[PDB]
């Protein structure tokens, strides 16, 4: 909801309200980064001429935004940590443990391991920073969190993903919503006959 | 569980365990409801001198289970202990079921009376006879004729008018019952033949 | 003196308002007797507790002396039992029955209500012996009179009777009364009365922890589906609690979430607290992660904060931290009766962690799982995964070489059909809705 | 009446002739008046005392003689007689230990509802003190959480009343449980795998394993048989339930 | 960017190319119908008429 | 058969004049005017000299039915 | 209308603060305790040498 | 007169059911008349 | 009196329920 | 999900509408 009503680059004042137009943009970049990973975001925000101009104004902000767009994790994680540090210095710090970096890398890891089947932990580690153990524990923590649809073959140190087909994943979504709405109609069956 | 005291091969131990079942029947239900197997063992153990009252508490077990008809059958097989007490609500329930059974059996055995009748149980006929006899002798003939007509006996109206004819308008009362209420001639013939023989 | 007089006059006016509420109740029963309608009776019983929180001994004696224009046993019982205050300046025109109204005998329904209203008033006054005597008179009168509409009254009357006897600790003695009225209800097909008596009986077995007898009776006693919503909720919760004690886990979670949904959302604060604690403990034992949105309950913050830490301990797999918090704030868990389960979760935390990590990993090392969940033993890790697979909670298998575990497979014949097979009861719900409509489309 | 309360049962009662004396005890003293009311009558209180004493003696005799019908009958009599809790009488001593043995063997009969409901009847009897009665609780706790061999070593001692045969009967339930657990979805079972790690180093248990259940021994290895199949599905019970739905909303 | 239909199996050093069947949009359309025909109605209506 | 079977029912059901209007709540209003005609005639037959007070009320709408 | 006080109604005796006083929706993972990620990545960079 | 009462209750159940069955028949009949018109 | 009165009334009403229900199809 | 449930929901809507109407009629008739 934030992004959908906040990409509008029509400011009531040239530099006011949110302390600047540059601060306005940084909020836009953060919100969009939380929003989505890489659909035709090239045609949604990257195509934005004012967007490209303000990223020219802020090189580091342009750096991580292009790093996410290019899916180059070696610079992405360092820049993502810089982003989290910057958000710490900001009063809009509400997702202190949920959606600073963990959600963005959940999107990034999903983007990475999708179109992959069995990418080795040792090589995905160096392609995504350093510390093979650090990536291994991060993957284990996020799989426990629920996202990163994959499993880890520890005896061989492999990342065997389980991406459902379009039919399979969507069928899973329908049975989930069927569960929620059976709960709903059972509640409504409670509402009746009383 | 007290079921072990009945599971012992000592007849005196069995009898001791099964005295107070008819007294704890009101308070304890779950323990007696689950003990159907034990009372079946006691019922099968007919060499023990308490077969009849074991069948009585077997009917009490089926009172707990909710099978009033099966409890009726068990107290039926006990025989003389079906009518231990004539004034209770469970007694009223079982006699009402037995009257319904007697009514159905009498109707079908009168619709097909040329032999091959379903065996009229001596034990069932005995308790039935006792129950409507006392319901006739309670000296409330505004309802004695009504329960008699519900019982559906061929000779019961004749018995009612041959006994103490309290409220002698009962003759006209049963007259209008057979004139308007009872009209299905196939089983009406019993009331009709009594009605013609008296009037 | 002006302020005190104004306050006394105002409270007397509210006392007269409550008397008019009781007078409205009397007119409701006059209409109910005229129309043979127990539904508007149910409305009267629904509206009584709303005004029940503010009554006065003097206004009760006013209603007693007014309604009992003709001398009756109810007035003779209330004269010594009801202790009205001293002389009061406020009096009302007590002449509701004149001529034929006074000549006609008292209605059994209003007699049961005055008796039930006295016993609620005695308990509000925190009296026991007089309350039990009025309640005994109520059940005696209801037993003697055999009208059909009285047993619907008798349901809630026996309900509150045994609730009083629970405070009296006669909750053991009242069992004979409960069973005797159960037999009468069985004779008269009084499903609501049956529902009340089993609920009282189950609470009796709860207070004595007589769970083996409770489960043996529940497994054989059929409960009415069309019973009252509150009685249904209490019965279902008690059934859920005893199944939880019985380790009937999937049935427990189904019953407890059904009971929570069946309870009124605006009321039943104590019932709500109990069901939150029940769902937290049972689902944590299951490993079914507790519902996070339930933590926003405004009435359960302090009780669920240690429960939140218990959830965190269950996910993590640590022992010492939650053992400390149990030693700190475990007394309320003992009062709720889940402390034996609490320790069971404390030692089944490893089982829950094994399930979650098995869902996480494809081929996890037995050494790795032992290190993760603080086993420090390859053999104990092998035993745990052996015990998980034999329980069938997870699909993790054992290969004594290194601990292999199979992965999933693409969708088969029945994997697309098990939702429709388990969900096509939609039309069964539709047909019972339609049948209820057929029952509930009376034209006049 | 009140004859030889424990005259020969305290020191040693190994003979079978004492069964007749016990039967005479049941006829005369156990059947004096009743065991139900226990309102007053301290004489009946002592009658309950002797009833519990002969029940524990019968329990010890039955567990030593290995007679399931007699032992179960004594267990049920013990439960029904103890159904009357009188707090003024001296509790414990006979209570916690016997209840632990009874519950432990009941779990060997695979009953958990009675175990937990008795635990709820005993709030602090099981957790605060009385290792006599928490020993079965600890054994079940370990046997549910993570242990097979650790359970065996834990079973090696009984603090309740010695009588280390409930551990053997639980050992018989866990050999059955282990056999089921290895008849589960396991991939392979070596002969040394079944013989060494778990238990039963080449006893008659080994012949029982090799002859009773499937998974025929290959080369020093038992292997899983045909249990998972592609199952080309005739799909007939989906048709029946579809017809059940059809008839369900073909009317009303 | 969904311009290709495959999965990169690095463990085998290959990429498994799969022909994705797109006729399964009935699935997503059905879910959208479930969402916008149930959520917008059941909660609103039966929270407005809480008492019945 | 429809008009016949909705008119020759009062011969049997005149023993229950209170049930004459009950068994025709659909016949007197049915889309078949002959069925409505039979229902009307059935109540008329089964109530010969009875002030039913209910058959009259249900037959009042049929006194002005559009079909002749 | 009654509050069903018969069931044990142990109201929460803190009455001090609402931890999630705003509309924030928490997750089971969101409440884990760590030194966020920036410090962890710095330690990762240090152990690799840069 | 108690089996009397039970038969009356079964009578009441039949009547209550037959209410909407009669009404449903009448309104569907009206619908068929409307479409014929 | 009322016994067979309600018996006959039940028989007739239970019948007419099923018969008028026969038109739902 | 979308024929049996939909029939159940619409039938439920009809019943709860009828129940509301019947309850209001019973309470406000007199």
């Amino acid at each position: 909801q934030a992004a959908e009503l906040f990409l509008d680059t029509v400011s009531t004042f040239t530099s006011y309200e949110l302390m600047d137009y540059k601060t306005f943009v940084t909020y836009t970049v953060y919100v969009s980064m939380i929003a989505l990973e890489r659909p035709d975001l090239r045609e949604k925000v990257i195509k934005g001429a004012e967007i490209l101009e303000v990223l020219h104004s802020l090189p580091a902000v342009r750096q991580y935004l292009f790093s996410l767009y290019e899916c180059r994790y070696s610079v992405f994680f360092q820049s993502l940590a810089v982003v989290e540090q910057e958000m710490k210095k900001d009063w809009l710090f509400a997702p202190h443990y949920r959606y600073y970096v963990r959600e963005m890398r959940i999107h990034a890891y999903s983007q990475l391991l999708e179109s992959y089947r069995s990418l080795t932990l040792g090589y995905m580690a160096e392609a995504f920073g350093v510390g093979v153990e650090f990536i291994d524990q991060e993957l284990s923590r996020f799989i426990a969190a629920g996202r990163l649809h994959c499993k880890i073959d520890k005896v061989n140190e492999i990342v065997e993903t389980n991406r459902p087909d379009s039919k399979n994943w969507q069928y899973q979504e329908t049975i989930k919503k069927g569960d929620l709405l059976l709960n709903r109609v059972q509640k409504l069956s409670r509402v009746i006959n009383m | 569980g007290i079921i072990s005291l009945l599971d012992e091969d000592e007849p005196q131990l069995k009898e001791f365990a099964l005295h107070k079942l008819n007294a704890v029947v009101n308070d304890f239900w779950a323990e007696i409801s689950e003990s159907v197997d034990k009372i079946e063992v006691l019922y099968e153990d007919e060499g023990f001198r308490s077969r009849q009252f074991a069948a009585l508490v077997a009917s009490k077990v089926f009172y707990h289970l909710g099978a009033f008809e099966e409890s009726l059958n068990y107290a039926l097989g006990a025989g003389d202990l079906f009518n231990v007490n004539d004034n209770s609500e469970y007694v009223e329930t079982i006699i009402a079921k037995c009257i319904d059974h007697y009514t159905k059996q009498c109707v079908e055995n009168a619709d097909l009376p040329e032999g091959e009748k379903k065996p009229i149980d001596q034990r069932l006929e005995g308790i039935v006879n006792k129950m409507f006899q006392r319901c006739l002798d309670d000296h409330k003939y505004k309802q004695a004729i009504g329960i008699a007509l519900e019982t559906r006996r061929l000779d019961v109206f004749e018995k009612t008018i041959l006994e103490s004819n309290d409220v002698p308008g009962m003759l006209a009362y049963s007259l209008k019952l057979c004139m308007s209420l009872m009209q299905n001639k196939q089983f009406r013939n019993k009331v009709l033949r009594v009605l013609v023989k008296i009037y | 003196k002006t302020a005190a007089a104004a306050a006394e006059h105002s409270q007397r006016e509210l006392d007269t308002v409550t008397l008019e509420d009781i007078k409205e109740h009397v007119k409701q029963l006059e209409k109910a007797v005229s129309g043979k309608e127990p539904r508007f009776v149910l409305r009267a019983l629904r509206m009584l507790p709303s005004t029940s929180r503010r009554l006065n001994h003097y206004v009760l004696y006013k209603a007693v002396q007014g309604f009992f224009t003709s001398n009756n046993a109810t007035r003779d019982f209330l004269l010594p039992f009801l202790e009205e205050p001293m002389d009061t300046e406020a009096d009302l025109q007590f002449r509701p029955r004149t001529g034929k109204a006074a000549s006609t005998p008292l209605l059994p329904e209003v007699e049961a209500y005055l008796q039930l209203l006295v016993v609620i008033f005695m308990m509000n006054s925190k009296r026991y012996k007089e309350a039990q005597k009025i309640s005994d008179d109520l059940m005696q009168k209801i037993s003697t009179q055999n009208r059909r509409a009285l047993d619907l009254v008798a349901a809630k009357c026996y309900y509150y009777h045994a609730r009083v006897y629970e405070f009296l600790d006669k909750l053991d003695v009242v069992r004979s009364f409960l069973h005797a009225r159960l037999r009468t209800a069985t004779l008269r097909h009084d499903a609501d009365g049956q529902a009340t008596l089993l609920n009282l009986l189950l609470r009796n077995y709860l207070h004595y922890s007589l769970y083996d007898q409770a489960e043996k009776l529940v497994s054989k006693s059929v409960f009415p589906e069309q019973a009252n919503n509150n009685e249904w909720a209490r019965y279902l919760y008690y059934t859920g609690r005893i199944k939880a004690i019985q380790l009937e886990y999937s049935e427990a979670r189904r019953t407890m979430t059904n009971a929570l949904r069946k309870a009124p959302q605006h009321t039943a604060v104590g019932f709500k607290q109990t069901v939150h604690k029940l769902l937290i403990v049972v689902e944590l034992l299951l490993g079914e992660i507790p519902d996070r949105l339930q933590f926003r309950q405004p009435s359960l913050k302090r009780s669920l904060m240690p429960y939140f830490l218990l959830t965190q301990a269950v996910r993590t797999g640590n022992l010492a931290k939650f053992n400390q918090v149990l030693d700190q704030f475990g007394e309320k868990f003992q009062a709720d009766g889940t402390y034996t389960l609490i320790i069971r979760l404390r030692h089944n935390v490893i089982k829950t962690g094994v399930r979650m990590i098995s869902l996480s990993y494809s081929r996890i090392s037995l050494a790795d799982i032992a290190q993760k969940l603080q086993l420090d033993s390859p053999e104990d890790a092998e035993f745990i995964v052996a015990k998980a697979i034999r329980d069938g909670v997870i699909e993790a298998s054992i290969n004594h070489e290194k601990g292999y575990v199979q992965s999933k497979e693409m969708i088969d014949i029945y994997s697309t059909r098990e939702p429709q097979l388990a969900f096509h009861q939609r039309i069964s719900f539709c047909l019972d809705i339609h049948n209820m409509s057929v029952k509930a489309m009376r034209f006049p | 009446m009140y004859e030889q309360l424990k005259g020969e049962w305290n020191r040693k009662s190994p003979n079978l002739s004492k069964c007749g004396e016990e039967l005479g005890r049941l006829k005369l003293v156990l059947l004096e008046l009743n065991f139900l009311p226990t309102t007053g009558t301290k004489l009946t209180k002592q009658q309950l005392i002797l009833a519990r004493d002969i029940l524990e003696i019968g329990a010890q005799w039955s567990i030593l003689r290995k007679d399931i019908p007699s032992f179960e009958r004594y267990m049920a009599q013990l439960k029904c007689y103890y159904f009357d809790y009188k707090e003024q009488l001296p509790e414990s001593a006979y209570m916690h230990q016997l209840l632990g043995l009874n519950l432990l063997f009941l779990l060997s009969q695979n009953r958990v509802a009675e175990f937990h409901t008795e635990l709820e009847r005993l709030p602090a009897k099981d957790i605060q003190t009385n290792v006599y009665i928490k020993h079965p609780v600890s054994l079940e706790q370990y046997l549910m959480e993570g242990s097979y061999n650790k359970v065996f070593l834990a079973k090696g001692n009984i603090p309740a009343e010695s009588y280390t045969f409930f551990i053997d009967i639980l050992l018989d339930t866990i050999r059955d449980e282990i056999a089921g657990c290895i008849e589960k979805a396991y991939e392979k079972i070596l002969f040394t795998e079944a013989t060494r790690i778990l238990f039963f180093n080449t006893p008659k248990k080994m012949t029982d394993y090799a002859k009773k259940r499937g998974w025929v021994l290959g080369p020093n290895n038992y292997y899983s048989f045909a249990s998972q199949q592609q199952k080309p599905e005739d799909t007939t019970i989906p048709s029946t339930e579809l017809a059940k739905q059809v008839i369900e909303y073909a009317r009303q | 960017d969904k311009k290709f239909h495959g999965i990169l199996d690095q463990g085998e050093g290959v990429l498994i190319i799969f022909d994705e069947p797109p006729v399964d949009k009935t699935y997503e359309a059905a879910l959208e119908t479930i969402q916008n025909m149930s959520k917008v109605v059941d909660s609103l209506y039966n929270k407005a008429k809480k008492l019945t | 058969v429809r008009r016949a079977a909705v008119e020759s029912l009062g011969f049997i059901l005149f023993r229950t004049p209170e049930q004459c209007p009950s068994v025709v709540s659909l016949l007197s209003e049915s889309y078949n005017p002959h069925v409505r005609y039979g229902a009307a005639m059935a109540l008329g037959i089964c109530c010969a000299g009875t002030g039913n007070k209910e058959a009259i009320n249900l037959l009042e709408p049929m006194t002005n039915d559009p079909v002749n | 209308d009654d509050e069903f006080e018969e069931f044990p109604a142990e109201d929460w005796a803190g009455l001090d603060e609402d931890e999630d006083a705003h509309v924030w929706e928490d997750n089971w993972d969101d409440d884990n305790v760590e030194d966020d990620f920036s410090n962890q990545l710095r330690a990762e960079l240090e152990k690799h040498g840069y | 007169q108690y089996y009397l009462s039970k038969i009356e209750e079964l009578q009441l159940i039949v009547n209550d059911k037959s209410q909407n069955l009669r009404r449903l028949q009448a309104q569907r009949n009206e619908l068929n008349a409307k479409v014929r018109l | 009196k009322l016994q067979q009165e309600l018996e006959f009334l039940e028989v007739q009403e239970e019948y007419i329920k099923d018969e008028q229900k026969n038109l739902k199809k | 999900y979308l024929a049996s449930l939909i029939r159940s929901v619409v039938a439920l809507h009809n019943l709860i509408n009828n129940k509301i109407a019947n309850r209001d009629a019973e309470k406000k008739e007199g």
Side-chain angles (χ1 to χ4, degrees), chain C residues 12-82:
Chain C
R12 283 161 37 179
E13 192 65 282
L14 277 296
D15 295 330
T16 59
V17 166
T18 54
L19 188 153
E20 297 307 315
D21 171 72
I22 304 178
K23 264 285 303 177
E24 200 168 29
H25 292 168
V26 174
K27 296 183 289 294
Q28 293 162 247
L29 277 296
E30 162 192 8
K31 212 279 185 176
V33 169
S34 181
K36 316 305 178 183
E37 65 183 1
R39 296 291 185 269
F40 183 75
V41 177
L42 305 178
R43 175 41 171 191
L45 202 163
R46 289 156 59 179
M47 67 183 296
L48 178 60
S50 61
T51 59
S52 179
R53 283 85 170 93
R54 184 168 182 171
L55 277 296
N56 188 359
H57 294 88
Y58 201 83
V59 65
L60 276 296
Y61 190 72
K62 288 175 153 303
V64 160
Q65 65 182 357
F67 301 156
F68 312 150
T69 309
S70 58
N71 188 359
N72 63 7
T74 69
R75 187 190 194 186
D76 315 299
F77 301 153
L78 276 296
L79 184 55
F81 290 163
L82 175 53

Side-chain angles (χ1 to χ4, degrees), chain A residues 1-12 14-15 17-26 28-37 39-68 70-96 98-127 129-170 172-194:
Chain A
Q1 186 173 355
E4 176 178 1
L5 309 184
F6 184 76
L7 282 72
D8 291 331
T9 187
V10 176
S11 305
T12 187
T14 304
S15 297
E17 296 293 336
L18 312 176
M19 290 298 306
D20 201 284
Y21 187 80
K22 299 163 54 177
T23 299
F24 182 76
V25 175
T26 54
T28 307
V29 169
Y30 300 154
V31 165
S32 63
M33 283 313 194
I34 303 178
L36 68 184
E37 208 274 330
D40 276 4
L41 192 63
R42 293 182 183 174
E43 293 177 350
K44 299 296 183 181
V45 304
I46 282 296
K47 188 187 178 302
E50 68 287 35
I51 305 306
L52 297 184
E53 190 185 13
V54 297
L55 280 71
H56 295 98
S57 70
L58 277 296
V61 184
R62 168 175 148 267
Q63 186 46 57
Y64 64 90
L65 188 153
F66 280 161
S67 304
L68 189 146
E70 295 151 342
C71 295
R72 293 202 299 250
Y73 293 72
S74 310
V75 176
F76 180 75
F77 291 167
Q78 188 271 353
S79 60
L80 183 62
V82 172
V83 165
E84 175 176 36
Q85 184 178 2
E86 192 70 284
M87 298 186 66
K88 279 187 172 49
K89 324 302 171 57
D90 289 345
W91 49 298
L92 283 72
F93 76 125
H96 62 86
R98 45 185 81 182
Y99 310 140
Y100 291 168
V101 298
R102 290 152 216 79
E103 182 65 26
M104 299 178 183
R105 68 185 68 188
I106 276 173
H107 306 160
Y109 291 165
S110 305
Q111 155 262 313
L112 183 63
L113 62 83
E114 294 294 328
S115 311
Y116 279 66
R117 181 177 181 170
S118 295
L119 174 59
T120 61
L121 285 156
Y123 290 76
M124 74 165 297
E126 75 173 11
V130 286
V132 176
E133 281 71 25
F134 203 104
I135 296 89
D136 186 74
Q137 63 84 9
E138 276 207 339
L139 293 198
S140 306
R141 286 186 53 182
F142 302 151
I143 294 178
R147 287 314 172 184
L148 281 65
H149 306 343
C150 67
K151 295 182 176 63
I152 309 303
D153 194 283
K154 198 56 185 294
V155 303
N156 313 326
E157 314 173 9
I158 319 181
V159 188
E160 293 178 335
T161 188
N162 63 6
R163 63 181 293 165
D165 291 325
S166 61
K167 164 272 201 173
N168 196 333
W169 204 77
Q170 204 304 309
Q172 170 195 353
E173 301 307 320
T174 55
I175 67 183
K176 298 298 293 295
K177 296 308 173 53
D179 291 331
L180 277 296
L181 277 296
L182 187 153
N183 183 20
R184 288 308 214 100
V185 302
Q186 283 271 0
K187 188 178 178 301
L188 308 186
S189 309
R190 181 264 179 178
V191 173
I192 193 65
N193 186 265
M194 71 178 296

Side-chain angles (χ1 to χ4, degrees), chain G residues 4-23 25-26:
Chain G
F4 292 166
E5 202 172 345
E6 175 190 25
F7 313 100
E10 285 72 36
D11 296 64
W12 63 273
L15 203 171
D16 178 72
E17 57 180 12
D18 185 10
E19 208 66 27
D20 203 319
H22 38 280
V23 297
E25 293 83 3
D26 63 358

